[PDB]
């Protein structure tokens, strides 16, 4: 009530409740997952639809040839950062004539999120992000937060029922590096299987995936491209 | 930066913040001034808790120019900024018109700056009042300004604590055809009626203006005025 109002208000606990409720926006939306191998990196996100007539919202976006992202949270905060992320990927080759390292790109992603936190009246972006890409050092998955901090992980299960599906990622984590293209998808499909009961399965309309790799630049496979991967594996 | 004005109207309609400023300058150090004959006399009192503070260092009486000088009763530090902008307006006057500034036109341009701070956002009104001393075109000038920016004019006036008694004491003692030297006497009499305790030359701060310009008095010539003679 008193101190819950604004971002710049310091509570006696030191926490910022507007950053707290900014992280709540991740729990308020569909779960998104991503994972990487020694070379390849795969983003498998659940496409969500409000009703059964409407099609499912596509959480997977295209950033650069070697980079792609997915969001869990407020849906329109992506295209705000997506315009800047796609701009910095162009700024790289426009100057350095080479793809920008992911550590240098995500460091600029946090920047735009650092400014509104310490200034009055503004808002942080409460959507969770998944940033994966291949570079000289290989795949790097950097997740960010509305707190403006960015992490690095091999795989992440975030959104609604986030920690419930991380047990599957925790058990097979040793395999994720050894997984090939199929084994990344085999454990990528079961990654979202832990986020939904058997009554909700992985189907062409509500599920889309994407893959970036060593010699394979980032691509997006939606329905019939994943049909041999979707069908044949059981929940 | 705040763009919102800090002062709003009361249910009665009167400005609430500036109304407090009249009580701010009321509890301050009393000050006396009179427009008499060849010039205007200003007698203030500089008082501290102990003699440890020097009189000559900082003065309440400051010249705006050779002609014009000011006194104040209210918040002390708020008188600073008014000194610079005055002299700044005085020089910007002297650059354009190459002449000393009349006392009339000077106050309006200074009061307009004070009233800009009762309008623009994030700025509080002044907690100090001004008595304008100037001599122009042969006739002396004594003006009174308030925190609201309204400028007045007085043949004789009083400012600070006990102005109630002072105004009644002025209507008694004050008369016309009084010389600057005689106007000093009436100013000291009012301060003797106002200030409680013994009155020395180091407490009282006096300065005057005339055809020879605005000059601040020395402690030596005040000794003859401490005897209640002129």
């Amino acid at each position: 009530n008193q101190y819950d109002n604004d971002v710049t208000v310091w509570s006696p606990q030191g926490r910022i409740h507007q950053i707290e409720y900014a992280m709540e926006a991740v729990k308020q939306g569909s779960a998104t997952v991503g994972l990487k191998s020694k070379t390849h990196a795969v983003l498998v996100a659940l496409k969500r639809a409000q009703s059964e007539l409407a099609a499912h919202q596509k959480k997977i976006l295209h950033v650069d040839n070697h980079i792609g992202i997915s969001i869990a949270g407020l849906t329109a905060d992506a295209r705000l950062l997506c315009n800047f992320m796609r701009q910095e990927c162009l700024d790289s080759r426009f100057v350095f004539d080479r793809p920008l390292p992911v550590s240098r790109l995500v460091s600029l992603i946090g920047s735009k999120t650092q400014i509104p936190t310490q200034r009055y009246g503004r808002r942080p972006y409460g959507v969770g992000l998944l940033i994966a890409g291949y570079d000289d050092m290989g795949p790097h998955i950097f997740q960010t937060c509305p707190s403006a901090n960015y992490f690095d992980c091999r795989a992440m299960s975030i959104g609604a029922r986030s920690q419930s599906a991380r047990t599957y990622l925790e058990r097979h984590m040793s395999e994720f590096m050894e997984c090939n293209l199929n084994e990344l998808v085999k454990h990528g499909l079961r990654a979202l299987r832990e986020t939904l009961p058997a009554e909700q399965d992985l189907t062409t309309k509500n599920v889309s995936i994407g893959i970036v790799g060593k010699d394979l630049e980032f691509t997006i496979y939606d329905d019939d491209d994943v049909s041999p991967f979707l069908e044949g594996l059981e929940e | 930066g705040y763009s919102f004005s800090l002062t709003t109207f009361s249910p009665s309609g009167k400005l609430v913040q500036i109304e407090y400023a009249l009580a701010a300058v009321a509890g301050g150090a009393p000050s006396v001034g009179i427009k008499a004959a060849n010039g205007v006399v200003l007698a203030t009192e500089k008082k501290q808790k102990s003699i440890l503070y020097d009189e000559r260092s900082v003065h309440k009486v400051e010249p705006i120019t050779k002609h014009i000088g000011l006194v104040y009763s209210g918040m002390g530090p708020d008188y600073r900024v008014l000194v610079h902008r005055a002299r700044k307006l005085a020089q910007q006057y002297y650059l354009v018109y190459q002449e000393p500034i009349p006392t009339a036109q000077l106050v309006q341009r200074v009061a307009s700056v004070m009233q800009e701070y009762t309008q623009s956002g994030g700025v509080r009104p002044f907690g100090v009042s001004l008595l304008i001393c100037g001599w122009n075109e042969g006739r002396p000038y004594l003006f009174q300004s308030d925190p609201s920016g309204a400028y007045f004019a007085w043949k004789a006036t009083a400012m600070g604590k006990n102005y109630v008694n002072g105004k009644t004491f002025l209507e008694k003692r004050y008369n016309e055809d009084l010389e600057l030297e005689d106007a000093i006497h009436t100013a000291i009499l009012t301060l003797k009626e106002s200030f409680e305790g013994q009155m020395t030359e180091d407490n009282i701060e006096v300065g005057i203006c005339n055809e020879a310009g605005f000059r601040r008095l020395t402690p030596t010539e005040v000794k003859d005025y401490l005897a209640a003679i002129a």
Partner: protein, 238 residues
């Protein structure tokens, strides 16, 4: 109290400012004290240095500052306010010499500094600084001078000052001491100023416990007194 006068800066029902008076009493929260005495050829400042941690460096932590070549400084209040306000004091003297081509006097130096602290009070935007500035130096015509700038902007020439946890008691203690009204030379100004804080605080200062800056006629450049001569002044009481 009426309205927001307890928070922002606006005139009270009796025409005062609560926020400015609050930060004025916040100077007592510094947990230290300072005093300044004007001598014949010199200006002496006796200030307290608090080093509770042996890890804390004694030399780099000081209230004694160097504003310019001929002028020193001391600060009493919040260190963040002090350390920041002193940087702007160096911009002035720099721009001063860049403008008028000579060292700024102690008189004009406190003016421009304290008048900028008034922009604080006039605005609910910027809070005032809880640092109480005390500046000394040399004006070759008038010799040494001693000033103190409150967060409100008030300043005057002081024969002696009061600062720190105990202020009103300092001037009350300086009543009988300055009442002697003898002429204090360089060493007499130093020895008498040390007696000030030593009796009130009930300490009997050690050379490492305090620090004393000085500036003189013959030495217009500011002088930092080493602990070798401090104990030489400390034995004047014994």
């Amino acid at each position: 109290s009426a309205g927001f006068d307890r928070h922002i800066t606006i005139f009270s029902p009796e025409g005062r400012l609560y926020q400015v008076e609050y930060a004025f009493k916040a100077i007592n929260q510094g947990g230290l004290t300072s005093v300044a005495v004007r001598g014949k050829d010199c200006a002496v400042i006796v200030t307290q240095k608090k080093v509770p941690d042996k890890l804390l460096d004694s030399s780099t932590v000081t209230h004694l500052f160097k504003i310019t070549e001929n002028i020193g400084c001391v600060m009493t209040g919040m260190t963040a306010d002090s350390r920041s306000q002193v940087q702007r004091a160096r911009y002035e003297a720099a721009n001063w010499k860049y403008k008028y081509g000579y060292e700024i006097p102690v008189d004009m130096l406190c003016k421009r500094i304290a008048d900028i602290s008034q922009v604080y009070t006039q605005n609910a935007e910027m809070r005032p600084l809880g640092c109480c500035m005390i500046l000394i130096g040399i004006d070759e015509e008038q010799g040494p001078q001693v000033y103190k700038c409150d967060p409100a902007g008030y300043y005057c020439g002081f024969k002696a000052t009061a600062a720190g946890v105990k202020q009103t008691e300092s001037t009350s203690f300086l009543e009988k001491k300055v009442k002697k009204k003898f002429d204090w030379t360089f060493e007499q100004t130093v020895e008498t100023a040390i007696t000030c804080l030593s009796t009130v605080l009930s300490i009997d200062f050690k050379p490492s416990e305090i620090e004393v800056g000085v500036v003189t006629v013959e030495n217009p450049k500011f002088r930092i007194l080493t602990e070798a001569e401090i104990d030489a002044h400390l034995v004047a009481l014994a």
